[model samples]
Target chain A: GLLDXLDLAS
Target chain B: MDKNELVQKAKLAEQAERYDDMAACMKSVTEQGAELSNEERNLLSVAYKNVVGARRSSWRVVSSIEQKTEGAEKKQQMAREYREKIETELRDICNDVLSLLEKFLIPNASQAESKVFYLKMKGDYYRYLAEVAAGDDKKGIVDQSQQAYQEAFEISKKEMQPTHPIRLGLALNFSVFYYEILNSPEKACSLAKTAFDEAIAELDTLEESYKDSTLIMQLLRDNLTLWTS
Candidate 1:
């Protein structure tokens, strides 16, 4: 998800 | 202990998490009072701040603005209570730790460079702190002071630090938040946040891709710009 990229978590 | 002895013990106590004993020693020597070296005075200021929770109180001040005040009267009552609770303990004196201590550093333009931009950053941080605690016209003045503190740190770093310096990125990131979250200025906030991210991206080829905290910082900049727009 875009938000996951935003979080830089994965 | 003498000043060095007191400071060493204070550092040891700090390491041991014995904040009270550290503050007591720092205060005892300070109150008995002779002239202090820059290092000792700085240590003592931090000691005083530790014992009194000046740093913690600033967070409460910031958080209070978001508090539920259902009516104008409720808001007024909160303001009154804020005035009572935000006793400048409690902060000053916490702040003066840097404020007075910085006087000893022989930096031109009253720069933050020699101090690793630390005291300047603290000054900026506490201006926001004071703004949070303030009301009326005083809030505007304190807000302006916070911006000016950040701007001055950036300006001095034009000569003193690298263009892609992490601290510069940090200053922009933090400064933008006041605009983004608090001051109702997405235009300005997004601009600053984007600039910080772009600065990091520009340095990518020259920088280590595996830098520990830097990747997260850059990522947050991107997140905030996304948030703003």
Candidate 2:
């Protein structure tokens, strides 16, 4: 998941 | 202050009774130098967001106008203005993407980052070409599609989400290149992956997640256009 890799919390 | 952002901020501020601050912010950010580079970039993004929001608003307004019994010029104008606004919005998205690319690079972490940036640039120009074709301002959809394909190649790169810095790349690509540009195939594919990732990450949330279901249900409804057989 791109968001996960980026540490983005959604 | 690109007159549009200024006007929006001015109106919101007025409604909130923060008129003075809103006006001042608009003036300083739009006309003066109160904001730093990041601040300026954010202001521009906000302006673009306002333009997109207004386009959506006009879409709703047009539907309402169509339903009204009155056959006024205002109704006719509303319908006409919706297309005009969308065209203007396409332009705004191009500008916003340009600005984002210019200021948002958090330093190149990999070769792919550079590649992604270049692709985004191509996409920006292609979006303009597509808009021009639609407006009958040009007759080059094929050429524009070629550029757009190049952009999609870069935009859909699996490496983009690998680095923290490139998260914005996916969001921007989805928002500007896919959704706004009306590339459902790309939009749905990207949105599906993005939403899946979001769900996995937020799986632990006990509650409080409502309408926003993330109606973003992956609003991309699966824009992957149902494109497959």
Candidate 3:
């Protein structure tokens, strides 16, 4: 849930 | 070198952006039970902040990868393992700094600025821990982070000027906690806007902290824009 807003996948 | 020399070395390490060496220097000074100046305490904060900050970034990357690979069982497992490894590293550093703060820095903090700084650091590390934590553990660490931030925020409002960089920095980080961890963009916007407006009112009163306070003020404004829009 925390990662939902983050642009971490790139 | 002795403890005093270690502090000097740490100062140079910080100036050089060599946080690992800085952490080594301050960690030894702290282990020796030497007294720390507010500057040294801030250096300690800087050192650990950079050190664990890198890992936090890495963990996020791996975690996102794991999420993306959810149906690919093998890839998911691999990413999960790597993420878990980073989480362990993150937890260790967080606990180490948290222990140092609770036991030494926070108690020995004499000035209001120092107290707020130490509390903010406590809140930050706990927020980091909450990133990888799950279930009740996550909830508990979130509570701890909120508590630390709340204490620091109250002290900062009472004792430090709104234009003080440390005070602004606390507001920035605390607002981030609300937006990112607590998932409350409304709360985040309110907190950031209040701090930014208050500081903007006294913008001309700033002196040596002009650069630092303005930088954090920009961040607060940026977050407000992003969170609100």
Candidate 4:
């Protein structure tokens, strides 16, 4: 995901 | 995971990503509630001071630019801004004085505060007068002098000994009334008073005080300038 680094939960 | 997130965070942070519509439609609303009255005065005073500094600096920079139509336009804009800032400062000072009057006992402490306030008011008046002079509004000079006189009366009534405030008043009077107003005799007299007070203060202190020596170098340096008959 492009938001992987900023994602709070995955 | 949802349960864990909810359980771990009593207060959840808002999260957003790749929302171009949100960016275009974003609205910021600031809500400040129940601020104590004491803080409001300080905040207002700080804001006024910031505006005053910005306007004064703008005027000063405009003054230093090359004299041309463009510069003249900027100067005119700066003059208006400067006047507006000065008026704002005056209003703030008046509010401060009113607040001090309400809280202060009508005795020595109150008297001293009043004196300081008046001196500050006078300084603002003098600044306005300088701005007026720069704008070539010679007619405003009298009104500026009147403001100075009102401030001077308050200071004189409250304080006794020669002090920095007194020196400042003398210097301001000379610079504004004498130098700018073209009243050499008045300027010389006030300058002499300023010089005397400054010298007295400087003498009592250490040698490190540097330039109390009114480089104005006693320029009465035998200008002995046939302003004399």
Measured against the true structure, the TM-scores of the candidates, in listed sequence, are: 0.57, 0.40, 0.87, 0.39
3 or 4, greater by DockQ: 3
Q: Could you give the candidate ranking by lDDT, starting with the highest?
A: 3, 1, 2, 4
In order, the B-chain TM-scores come to: 0.58, 0.41, 0.91, 0.40
lDDT of 1 by residue, B28-138 (tens): 565544545545545654555455554455646644663544468767676656655555545554454444334443232233443434444444445445544546655
Cα deviation at B109, candidate 3, in Å, is 0.5
What's the TM for model 4?
0.39
For model 4, the DockQ equals 0.01
On residues B13-92, what C-alpha lDDT tens digit does candidate 2 reach at each position? 64675534453554445443222243343443344334444444565565466567267877677666665666575566
* TM-score of decoy 2: 0.40
Task: State candidate 1's TM-score.
Answer: 0.57
lDDT of each: 0.51, 0.46, 0.82, 0.39
Residue B17 displacement (Å), model 2: 8.7
TM-score of 3: 0.87
Model 4 CA lDDT for position B173 = 42
The TM-scores, chain A only, for the candidates as listed are 0.45, 0.43, 0.42, 0.39
Query: Candidate 2 at B106: error in angstroms?
Result: 12
Native contacts kept, each candidate:
0.00, 0.05, 0.00, 0.00
Better of 3 and 4 by lDDT: 3
| CAPRI accuracy category, model 1 | incorrect
**Tens-digit lDDT string for candidate 3 (B179-210):** 88999988988989999999988865545547
